């Protein structure tokens, strides 16, 4: 009823959308992994009379449900998708998207890691993102590679029309005491990568983490704090 959705308000196997700004939504789904249930976010950005999708809904069935929820709530076709790193909460569902006619994209680093680890593989490579601080335009967003953080390949996404910063899993929610799933992380570089985000997007008004509730710019400093404390 208007609050940001959590696992407790998403019916089993379903997806919810949340309006972030004009022409910007997040998508929220839930998935089980190693015997625990987690929420995860993605982004939808209006691209004229089409939509750009950022990240899958963490699984094939969740991603089919995402497409159906978009059709119900928005009614414009998803034509392209970008996955912001190689983990299943970002690429699981790419096969569903590709068979629905969505063109799927990721950096070459993400594509290599997905292939090596047995995750679904976006079709198209995003060049121009291989050095920290790199940025490229992609429809109504800017894609930015901040450096290694949650993963070595993680990208962030900025919506300049709305000053929305989608940090993906490199950014944690304010209520998080934990640095999340750090299996593939670089804890030593993560604060430096967050500092690059902070420097590049000082006018961000909304910051969306890969999991949990959006907030403001404080999510960036909070993330650096929790990662340093985890490392400590
Ligand atoms: C698919 C993804 C994954 C699976 C399960 C939970 C999470 C979390 C995560 C978020 C937030 C909280 C926690 C956990 C705990 N409390 C939190 O608030 C994150 C994140 O932090 O983004 N991601 C997760 N995977 C798998 C894996 C392990 C690797 C193969 N051995 C691949 O790494 C990874 O991220
Ligand atoms: Zn991840
Ligand atoms: Zn994640």
- On whether the CB atoms of residues 5 and 28 are closer than 8 A, the answer is yes
Give the integer Cα–Cα distance in Å for 91 and 85: 8
Residue 181 alpha carbon to ligand 2 centre in Å: 7
Q: Report resolution (Å) to 1 decimal.
A: 1.2
State how far Cα 141 lies from the chain centre: 13
Among 206, 154, 218, smallest CA distance to 18 is for 206
Q: Max CA-CA distance within the chain?
A: 48
Question: CB-based contacts of 195: which residues, under 8 Å, 6+ apart?
Answer: 224
| Strand locations in 171-211 (E) | 206-209
Q: Is the CB of 211 under 6 A from ligand 1?
A: yes
Give the integer Cα–Cα distance in Å for 60 and 57: 8
Q: Is the CB of 38 under 6 A from ligand 1?
A: yes
Q: 15-231: which CATH topology?
A: Metallo-beta-lactamase; Chain A (3.60.15)
**Sheet with 50-54: strands ordered across:** 15-21, 24-33, 36-47, 50-54, 78-82, 103-106, 124-125
Q: Is the CB of 182 under 6 A from ligand 1?
A: no
Active-site positions?
85, 87, 89, 150, 181
């Amino acid at each position: 009823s208007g609050e940001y959705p959590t696992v407790n308000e998403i019916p089993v196997g379903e997806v919810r959308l949340y309006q972030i700004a004009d022409g910007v939504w997040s998508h929220i789904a839930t998935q089980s992994f190693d015997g625990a249930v987690y929420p995860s976010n993605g982004l939808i950005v209006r691209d004229g009379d089409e939509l750009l999708l950022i990240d899958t809904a963490w699984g094939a069935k969740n991603t089919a449900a995402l497409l159906a929820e978009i059709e119900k709530q928005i009614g414009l076709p998803v034509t392209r998708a970008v996955s912001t790193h190689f983990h299943d909460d970002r690429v699981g569902g790419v096969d569903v998207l590709r068979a629905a006619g969505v063109a799927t994209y990721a950096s070459p680093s993400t594509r290599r890691l997905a292939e090596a680890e047995g995750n679904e593989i976006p079709t198209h490579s995003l060049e121009g993102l291989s050095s920290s601080g790199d940025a490229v335009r992609f429809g109504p967003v800017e894609l930015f590679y901040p450096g290694a953080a949650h993963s070595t390949d993680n990208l962030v996404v900025y919506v300049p029309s709305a000053n929305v910063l989608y940090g993906g899993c490199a950014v944690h929610e304010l209520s998080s005491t934990s640095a999340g799933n750090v299996a593939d992380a670089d804890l030593a570089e993560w604060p430096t990568s967050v500092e690059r985000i902070q420097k590049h997007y000082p006018e961000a008004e909304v910051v969306i983490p890969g999991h949990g509730l959006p907030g403001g710019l404080d999510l960036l400093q909070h993330t650096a704090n929790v990662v340093k404390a985890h490392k400590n």
